Design a binder for this molecule. Sequence first.
Ligand SMILES: Nc1ncnc2c1ncn2[C@@H]1O[C@H](CO)[C@@H](O)[C@H]1O
Ligand SMILES: Nc1ncnc2c1ncn2[C@@H]1O[C@H](CO)[C@@H](O)[C@H]1O
Ligand SMILES: CCOC(=O)c1ccc(N)c(N)c1
Ligand SMILES: [K+]
Ligand SMILES: [K+]
Lengths: 330, 330
Amino acid sequence: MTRFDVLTVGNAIVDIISRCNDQFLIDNQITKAAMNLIDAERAELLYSRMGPALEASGGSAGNTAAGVANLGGKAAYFGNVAADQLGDIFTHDIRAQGVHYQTKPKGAFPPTARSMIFVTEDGERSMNTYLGACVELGPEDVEADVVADAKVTYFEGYLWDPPRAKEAILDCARIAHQHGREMSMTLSDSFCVDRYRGEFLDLMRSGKVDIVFANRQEALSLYQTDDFEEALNRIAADCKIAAVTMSENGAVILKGRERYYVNAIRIREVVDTTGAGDLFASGFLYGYTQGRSLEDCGKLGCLAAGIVIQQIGPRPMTSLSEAAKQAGLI
Amino acid sequence: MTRFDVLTVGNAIVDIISRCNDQFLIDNQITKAAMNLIDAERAELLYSRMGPALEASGGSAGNTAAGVANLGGKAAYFGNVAADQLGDIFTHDIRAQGVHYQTKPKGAFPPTARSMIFVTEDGERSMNTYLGACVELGPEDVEADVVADAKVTYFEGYLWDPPRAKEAILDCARIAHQHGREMSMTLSDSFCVDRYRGEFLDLMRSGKVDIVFANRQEALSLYQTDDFEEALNRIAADCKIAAVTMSENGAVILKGRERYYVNAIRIREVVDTTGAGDLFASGFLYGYTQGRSLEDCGKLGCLAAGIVIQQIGPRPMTSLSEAAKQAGLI
Ligand SMILES: Nc1ncnc2c1ncn2[C@@H]1O[C@H](CO)[C@@H](O)[C@H]1O
Ligand SMILES: Nc1ncnc2c1ncn2[C@@H]1O[C@H](CO)[C@@H](O)[C@H]1O
Ligand SMILES: CCOC(=O)c1ccc(N)c(N)c1
Ligand SMILES: [K+]
Ligand SMILES: [K+]
């Protein structure tokens, strides 16, 4: 009997969300559909140009933990905020969803990370992230008893950007595996992959990462190929289990020579794609820690992903567990 | 020609929004559909029990100014925040809508006001407001040049709660009337009216308030009657122009013996009633300052109101001016 099903580790972020036209992206040299890192000066500049906005707790892994909790699984989260109002919001939202969150702020500066997310008419999201207090996450924030007591520890590729987070993750890897648990990562973003390609591959090939999440872009980038079939064969060879999403075309789960294809739910309208990948991981990891088939994990992933893209905000405001019961996924 | 069509004055507040069941209201002794004032200790308590939330810039008058700006009118706002992150959010959202907002924060403490708004399945909103830095708004925040140059200065009844706001308002009344402009107020909330009945009536009868906004509940409370026909006759006798909203039953505008009845627009679904009255006033005051007839002012009000209640958040995220152009109201 174990304390947690899923522990996630990520950049703790509050989203600042606004709708824009595509000319806004071009005028501001914002790479569309991507995570764009920005300094404090650029953050002020972009905000000055941003329309009236809504705020909502974010962070890829934070969203994923929240999604596991919503579904009914037992979640935990590691991520550093500042001792400020944005930090208080982040802390409230994740804890109120029923996720264990005990990471202590280190001070007020740097302030709590934020991401200005611009949503275009097509529902695509373009993120502009000032990492703030995220740069302070290190080994000192690893709650060893939590990693030891979690079926899966899952982390973002995004953590390779701040300086010392990777050290926390290696510490996590070691504790998890010594306790016979498994480690999971998402590739996060195609440019993030570009930046850390060798390191990500090393994590997979050394056995420090057991299950890998990727979308089509991330997979294509990982192997710098335009051949998706090549990407699928290579990713299968590089990790024990790979879950590869393909947006409206659904997902394929890979294990050794096994492939399991899952359909995407049919959408009324794409509101905002923010959190689709995160919530796919929520459903997959919930199913996975409940002992479900790799196909059923895929199904749960697509269900959670499908729900999150039909609302504003990265964390489902409706009941995932209820949705899963209605869908016969239970 | 003048710089401003509408100046509004109010409690500068950021909303913290969550959906709840009706048992939540009962267990926490929250008065349904009402503005519930709370201290710092109660705010912490309620937040600790609140679910994952979304933040959005609020304040009744704030929403109203932003709504006038959305429709194409020239707006200005007086309201006091603190020098903190919530205050920076408030300052951003109202300015980015093209509202003149120059009220200077006095420090970091008390912090920026916030209201925890719980939305029930029926779409009703129950607000729980800590006034924070709002208690510091006073005559010193009256930008005399703005009042002098605004066609209408509009204020909340809610302003009678903080200690010195009423002094700013009397200064606005004097300046507005001496420059040949009009003063407007909203009765805000039925319990607010209970609290300040004598003072509100005196504002109306002395000529400091020319145009009054009320919903059915507020009108009945103003005269402590369950006879709505009595309320309409009495309100028409106490102010020059009365705009009385009746939710799904639309509105009635009253001027002397004239009555102009307006229908509510067709609604897909009542998502969240937060801002309905605020945006009615936006539509009304936009028409009014554009020389439109009282009936067409009603119509523009009902349109702006009808749009706001079909979304989460108190400020329409879509173009009101475009909606009005499509609506044949121009
Ligand atoms: N650098 C980053 N690291 C982790 N998460 C991020 C980063 N930038 C944006 N996000 C989060 O990604 C989520 C969508 O997947 C958003 O909620 C946003 O907060
Ligand atoms: N005491 C108050 N004074 C002014 N506005 C308020 C108060 N409490 C809540 N509000 C605002 O009322 C709006 C809905 O009319 C919400 O956006 C909320 O911010
Ligand atoms: C409900 C939020 O309020 C506070 O935390 C708070 C209020 C007043 C103060 N002076 C301080 N320091 C904090
Ligand atoms: K979304
Ligand atoms: K609303």
